[PDB]
Structure formats: C-alpha cells, structure tokens
Structure 1
C-alpha cells in the first residue's frame, strides 16, 4: 500500500569502497573479536559492464574461511567482514586504491587447492625473483590486473562466525 520501503542513513564511512545490500540477514551483528573464525563465500568480478567472473567460490564448492587476526591478506576485506551482519548477501564496489595486493592473493587462492600449500614461503620468494629477473607467470588474472589496475566488485555471502579457537 505504501511505495516507500527504505530510509536514507549513513554507513560505509571509509572512502574508496561503495556498498550495496543485495539481500537481508537474520540475527544481530555477529561477535567480531580477535581469534574468531569466519566462514564466508566470496566472488570477485570486474567492475566493467561485462562483470566477468574472476574468482568464484561457488564452482569450487569450498567456502573460504579466515580467522580474526593479523593475516593482513587485504585490509578492506578485514573491514567489510567486520562491518557485516550474519547471513547477509552483499555487494561491495571497491576502487583501484585497495586492490593492489589482490593478484598475488588470487594466485594463492587459485593454487591453494590446485596442488600448492601455503606452509612454504620460499617458493613465493622464488616466484618473485623469477618475475623480477627471469620470466613471467603468464596467468590471465595477473596479466589483466597487474598490468592494468581497475576497481573491482565483490559479492560476499558470509556463512557463520565461530567461537575463538
């Protein structure tokens, strides 16, 4: 009976990232303290009108998970997950500023189940030396993003947050 269904308000104080809420979520704000484990499906596509998929967690079938700690994989994700309510499908339009460290993380996330383990850090140094002097990885995502950086769009579907440890 009433056309109006929303009211403007403030959120997403940090600049360089646009926020939209694709779907609602049940429950209050999740307990976000250091040590808590977070399980959250993610998908990263291009900001362009094509919106081609770069990384999808759904085809793999393994929802990526983290802990609330100083992994410093990407600060903006560490903020967005904290600034989220459980069971909330959401869309985030970041900018070229934050998405500088992305390509290496994308390579690691594509190769974590491909046959490479994160328990080693010398292989990454060897890869950096190869990139600097010897050769190039040649991966499509690396060429598309490292050579030309663009803003990205991230779909986040968090599953749950566990008690610490």
Structure 2
C-alpha cells in the first residue's frame, strides 16, 4: 500500500531487490491481468492469455502516467494487486482497444489502424469489441494484477 487518491495496492509476491531505476526512457516489461470487481473478478485483458508480455516506456519520470504510477512502485519479479476507483478507469477501454490493436501487429504511426480506427469509432460508435463498449457505458472500478519482469535503461 503506497498512496494516491482512489488507488489501493496489495503486494502479494515480493520482488528480488531494491526499487529499480525508473528513469525517463526506461523500457518496463511486465504482465498484467485486468478484472472487474464483480464476483467472478471477470477478466477483461490478460497478457499471459495472449502469450507475450507487455512493454512500455517511461514518457517522463517527473510527469508520470497513471499506469507508470503503478509500474513505478514495483521491485522486479513483484506481483501486486492495484485496485483503482472509477475516476482512473475511464480511459481503460481506449487503452485496451489500443493494446489489442498492438497485439494483432499495428501502431498509431501507421496511418490506417489510427485513421481507419477513427472512421469506425465515429461511423459506428464502437471501440471494436463489446466488453470495452459495455465497460465504457458502465463506468466502475477495476483491479489490475501486475507482474514486473524487467526494467532496461535507454540506448
């Protein structure tokens, strides 16, 4: 349990070592599973299920991003549970959308994924998957279980 408003952490398998060097331009590599707080703890996304782990890069260590707040409180090999209130979870459907597109093998830089993705959202009022659409329309909290695997410094 660290502290920002509307976020409750619960470490559940501690990491091997002191807090790592989370500096601007570090690639953080990890696994995550995100779940509703219904009875099922219904799973919405799970990197293990898709197979490959997720890599992000620290935009700026002083202007930290809401996921980077979670990632940056983690020692390597740590597995932690981050509950997050409705306030932080509004953007999740659009992240999830963006990641699911990543998986298939396509990036905003590439015109279409982006532009075609905008066409479809405007034309049809959809992110492209019902669960994210359901999730958008019923804002709520989410629990993200995360395993930190690796942290590299920039080239």
Tell me if TM exceeds 0.5. Answer: yes
Alignment of 1:11-160 (within 5 A): 11-70=1-60, 75-120=65-110, 123-160=113-150
- Residues 105 and 49 from structure 1, CA distance in 2 versus in 1: closer, same or farther, beyond 3 angstroms? same
**Stretches of structure 2 lacking an aligned partner (at least 5 in a row):** none
Q: Deviations over 1:32-89 (max 9, x none)?
A: 1111111111111111121011100112221001111159999321111111211100
Relative to structure 1, is the Cα distance of residues 129 and 108 closer, same or farther in structure 2, using a 3 angstrom cutoff? same
Write the deviation string for residues 79-134 of structure 1: whole angstroms up to 9, x where unpaired. 11111211100000001101111111111211222243332256434533543355
Q: Is the 8 A contact 1:73 1:105 kept in 2?
A: no
1:29 Cα deviation (Å)? 0.6
Q: 1:93 to 1:74 in 2, by over 3 A?
A: farther
| Secondary structure of 2:74's aligned partner | coil
Q: Which structure has the highest helix share of the two?
A: 2
Unaligned runs of 5+ in 1: 1-10
Partner SS for 1:129: helix
Q: How many equivalent residue pairs? A: 155
For the aligned residue pairs, the C-alpha RMSD in angstroms reads: 2.6
